RNA sequence: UGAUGGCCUACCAAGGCGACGACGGGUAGCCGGCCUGAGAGGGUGACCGGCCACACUGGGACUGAGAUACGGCCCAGACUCCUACGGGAGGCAGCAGUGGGGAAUAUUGCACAAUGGGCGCAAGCCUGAUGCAGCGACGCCGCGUGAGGGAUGACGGCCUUCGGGUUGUAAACCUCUUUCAGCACAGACGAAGCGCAAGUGACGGUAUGUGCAGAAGAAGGACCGGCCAACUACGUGCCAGCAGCCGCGGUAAUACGUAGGGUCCGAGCGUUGUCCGGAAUUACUGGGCGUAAAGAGCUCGUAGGUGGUUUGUCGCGUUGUUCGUGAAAACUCACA
């Protein structure tokens, strides 16, 4: 990660669509034992992701710091993944576990503010959250915390998948406290989708 | 685990694990020093660190590190000793205040200029 | 043997977790109730009671949409004994925010989080599941 | 209290624009010093303590009675930036700032210092006073006939009253409306990272 | 004996009182049995709210106002109604009427258009 | 004895108390609260409030409606003082302040003007309570030390690459009205107070407002290896030293020391001492026990916990409801 800043006269700089918000969160020196000598390569755990919401994770253990960045960015672009949520809130608080790593999450008021870790700051607001809770525990690590992120993210799901199971419809899976958050949600995006139109 | 056998008993913390031993928690305390002689530090950190040990006013005997340059303490002196962690040296954490009730301020200290006892350059 | 509630919801979580399609059952009225209401629900697909040792049995087909899918997401006694609970009618817990649904045995009988809510009535809650 | 020190250093330090048409700072953006130039060690800490700085001095706020602000910002019932933005868009001279009536912070400042302002008809030489909605406001008369005073007030060319301030007469009188509304400040950069810090 | 006592409230230089019930053997702030009133010579007016008919309780069983509080009884009129020698009226004055919150600022738009 | 009551007393009888911890050792006044913590939880009883205990020490007694009777008493000691040496006389854990302790805690102050209390029919008398002032950045809160223009930045410092740059729009200068401070002038609420004699404020001529004068009289304080915003140069080269950790000095340290130069804070600014959380680092919320801390060498079982299916009762647990209730301040909402 040096010398990034570049004006040159050559052709171009690999710009794409998806203007997706890219994080890195750790790189650790990783020594292979040749007979008599040592080996040293990275480790770059890259989070990519998009203010709509969806995520995706790499992992690119690479010689180079520019290398592993690039194998995790195309890993993560390989192994995305998509999280529902409450406008800026979560559907519901859930836990998420890597092995030692626990990640609690939780609806906040709105305007209250993604409250994270460090990592899990990073795994988050490249998601669309703006105002959860969150903590995490346990793992003394990071690497499974990230890991965690993820596990915790995937338990969630619209109340139509409670609504399906029941055969009910919402109420009991949706009460009118998330409904009227999902209503406050969706009734922003339409007056954004409408102010979008002209 | 075994609620019931909470209620019989459990729950306590493990240990304070006191740091301050002067007395009462004190800010500072006073007394007289002794043994300024000057021992080793760490063998990494290759230097020479002027400490004494004092016996405060608390009546217990502890030992205080003499910090900057020059010290004005000696023999039979009011020297008020503050706590310190000195990593440095082996069953040091004790300093002695500059410019106060006995050793003057560093002489010259101009970094720092409130610790090391360094009045205000005129 | 100590706990008879706990190894129904027990059996019901291994069952549905271990991909059966059905559990069997001695017929005591809590756990029928229980299993009443869980088909009420619809977080299973239908329980049926017939006739066993001395007492009787039931028997209950977990709901599986289109793939082996479980309505169930999980279950579990908290007024267990040993730490039996109970609760008022004001803070009657929601159940996954408010997603799932729970068992609060009321004074009245039988009633979950949002039925207790519209009533008003507390006194003891059971598992819930969502 | 008060601060001392000039805008332009602080401007070319924190990066942004604090006199608002600093013509050097614009012409020594880098920070000031012998490594203005020399790159910093980047941190989202640098990132924070920056925008807070730059919001400390673009108004002349000190930092003690900065922190109040975003603690009584947390207390209020909306979301503490919002509150924070709104509060320090309601202070006495940033409301007769906004009326285009002072050509610098500092002129508020300075003013309020003297004794030139009157709200409600009371005299208050505290910038620290709390305008309400609704205060009537008018100018003592031996800063109107001041001669750089008569140059801010018949040259206010300068930044447009917003809407929740209403010069309404020769005489100055600022007849507030309503609150500093988020959709109407036109606020400098924001101040969630000073929520997320502070609530840590 | 029983003594209806004015107590001290509020910062140094402006003074304020709570017109309470209270035993002799107490301090000037002890326990009130019940606040039955609130003056403040600080304020224009001297304004006084008594809460009227525990005050007229409180005679009949006995109460005996201090001499500033019997003062202020007095300059209610409530001593003419427990002794009710001429009849109770309303003997104590009032703050000035002063304008209102809003009709202020009605009457500074009014003025500057 | 005011009333019950081994409270005491004569007799009778042998009970009564505990592992749901007696009896002991140590420790401590306690609460409204306060503070931390998201919460639970944790720590404190500052001050302001609510009660209790105690007033050289230990025994005893008094009276009055009421006594550990702090400025009531006797008796036994201590200590101190005076002593015709025969003997007597003394008690601030009240307001000041003295000595001692300790790093640390202040006046031998003004009025009873307002409030409260006691005696007096009252006038009035008494209150080191109270109302006030003095002393401490002890702590909070609020204000000022100015302001604008002003160049290619002058003077200079520091780096320097030797160009030039940081200082720096800073500056020198040209103007602005001067807050507050300083000088003069008036200047009280608080008091519808009391007194029935014509008066009545310690606070306080303080504020308060009324003219005056010029930027004029008012800024320092930590850091700059990373954590963790702030770097270079020069100097000491394992020395001097710095460091909360990890750790920087054995000639070139952004870590030391020195200079600029930068970060930030500001009449403050840092250091020490202590508590909470971060700690899930007691895991109820919210932990574990094959190899990391942790299943006694193995049995039974007292206490204890602990419970199969089903009928009716009770509603103790548990929940629902009405009311008394939880001082004020607390703390918050809302108003001034």
Redesign the pocket.
């Known amino acids: 990660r040096g010398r990034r800043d570049d004006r040159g006269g050559r052709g171009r700089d690999g710009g794409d669509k998806s203007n997706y918000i890219e994080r890195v969160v750790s790189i650790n020196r990783v020594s292979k034992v040749v007979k008599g000598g040592r080996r040293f390569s990275f480790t770059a755990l890259v989070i990519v992701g998009d203010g709509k919401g969806m995520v995706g994770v790499g992992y690119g253990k690479a010689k180079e710091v520019p290398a592993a960045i690039a194998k995790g960015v195309e890993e993560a672009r390989k192994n995305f993944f998509r999280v529902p949520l409450i406008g800026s809130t979560i559907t519901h608080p859930v836990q998420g576990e890597a092995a030692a790593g ?1 990640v ?1 999450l939780r609806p906040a008021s709105p305007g209250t503010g993604v409250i994270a870790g460090g990592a899990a700051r990073a795994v988050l607001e490249c998601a669309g959250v703006h105002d959860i809770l969150a ?1 995490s ?2 793992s003394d690590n990071a690497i499974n915390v990230v890991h965690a992120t993820v596990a915790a993210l995937k338990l969630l799901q619209r109340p139509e998948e409670v609504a399906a199971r029941r055969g009910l419809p919402i109420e009991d899976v949706a009460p009118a406290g998330m409904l009227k958050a999902r209503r406050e949600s969706e009734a922003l995006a339409a007056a954004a989708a409408r102010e979008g139109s002209a | ?1 075994t ?2 056998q ?1 209620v ?1 008993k ?5 240990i ?1 694990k ?3 031993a002067a007395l ?7 007394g007289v020093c002794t043994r300024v002689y000057t021992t080793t ?2 063998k ?7 400490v004494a040990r004092v016996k ?2 608390s009546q217990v005997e502890v030992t205080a590190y003499i ?4 010290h004005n303490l000696q023999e039979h002196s009011m020297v ?1 000793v ?8 082996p069953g040091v954490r004790y300093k002695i205040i500059r410019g106060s009730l006995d050793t003057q301020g ?1 002489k ?9 006892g ?1 009045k ?1 350059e005129k | ?4 509630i706990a190894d129904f919801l027990t059996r019901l979580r291994n069952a549905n977790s271990a991909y059966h399609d059905e559990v069997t059952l ?7 109730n229980i299993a009443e209401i869980l088909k009420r629900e619809g977080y299973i697909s239908d329980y049926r009671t017939e006739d066993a040792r001395v ?1 009787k049995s039931l028997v209950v087909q977990l709901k599986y949409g289109p793939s082996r899918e479980r309505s169930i997401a999980g279950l579990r006694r908290v007024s267990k ?2 730490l ?1 609970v ?5 803070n009657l817990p929601r159940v996954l925010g408010g997603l799932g649904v729970a068992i609060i045995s ?2 009245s009988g039988l009633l979950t989080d949002r039925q207790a809510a519209r009533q ?5 809650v059971l598992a819930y599941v969502w | ?10 401007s ?3 990066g942004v624009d604090l006199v608002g048409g ?4 614009e ?2 953006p880098y ?8 790159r ?2 980047e ?1 989202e ?2 990132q924070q ?1 920056q925008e ?2 730059k919001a ?2 673009s108004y002349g706020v ?5 922190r ?1 602000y975003y603690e009584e910002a947390n ?1 209020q ?1 909306g979301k503490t930036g919002d509150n924070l933005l709104r509060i320090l868009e309601s202070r006495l001279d940033n409301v007769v700032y906004r009326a285009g009536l002072a ?2 912070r ?2 508020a ?2 003013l ?5 302002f009157l709200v409600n008809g009371v ?1 208050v ?5 709390r305008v309400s909605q609704y205060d009537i406001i008018d100018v003592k008369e ?2 109107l006939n ?4 008569q140059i801010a007030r018949e040259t206010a060319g300068e930044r447009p009253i917003p809407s929740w301030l209403q010069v309404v007469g020769e005489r100055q009188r600022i007849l507030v409306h309503q609150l500093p509304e988020r959709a109407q400040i036109d606020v400098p950069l924001t101040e969630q990272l000073i929520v997320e810090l502070y609530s840590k | ?1 029983v ?1 209806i ?4 409230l509020g910062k ?4 304020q ?1 709570r017109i309470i019930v209270a035993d ?9 049995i019940e606040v039955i009133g609130r003056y403040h ?2 304020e ?4 006084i709210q008594i809460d009227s008919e525990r005050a007229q309780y409180w005679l009949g069983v006995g109460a005996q106002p ?4 019997l ?1 202020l009884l007095k ?1 209610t009129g409530d001593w003419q109604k427990f002794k009710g020698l001429p009849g109770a009226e309303g003997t ?2 009032v703050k000035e009427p002063k304008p209102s ?1 809003l009709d202020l600022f009605n009457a500074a738009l009014a003025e500057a258009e």
């Open positions: 626990v609690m903590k525990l346990g | 685990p609620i019931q909470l019989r459990g729950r306590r913390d493990k304070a006191v740091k301050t009462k928690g004190s800010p500072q305390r006073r530090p760490k990494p950190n290759s230097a020479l660190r002027k405060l006013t910090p900057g340059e020059g008020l503050r706590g310190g962690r000195v990593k440095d040296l560093v010259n200290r101009k970094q720092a200029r409130s610790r090391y360094a205000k | 043997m100590t706990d008879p001695p017929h005591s009225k809590l756990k029928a007492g004994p040993g039996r109970y609760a008022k009618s004001t009321t004074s008003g009535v507390g006194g003891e | 209290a008060r601060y001392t020190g000039p805008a332009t250093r602080k070319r330090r924190l600093d013509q050097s700072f012409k020594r920070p000031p010093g012998q490594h203005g130039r020399a910093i060690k941190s800490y640098r303590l807070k700085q400390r001095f000190m930092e003690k009675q900065f109040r207390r019932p050509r610098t500092r002129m400042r300075q309020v210092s003297h004794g030139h005299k030489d505290i910038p620290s006073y031996k800063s001041t001669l750089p005073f | 004996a003594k006592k004015l107590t001290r140094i230089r402006n003074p009182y002799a053997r107490t301090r000037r702030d002890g326990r009130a010579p600080k224009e007016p001297s304004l201090t001499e500033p509080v003062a300059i104590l004055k919150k």
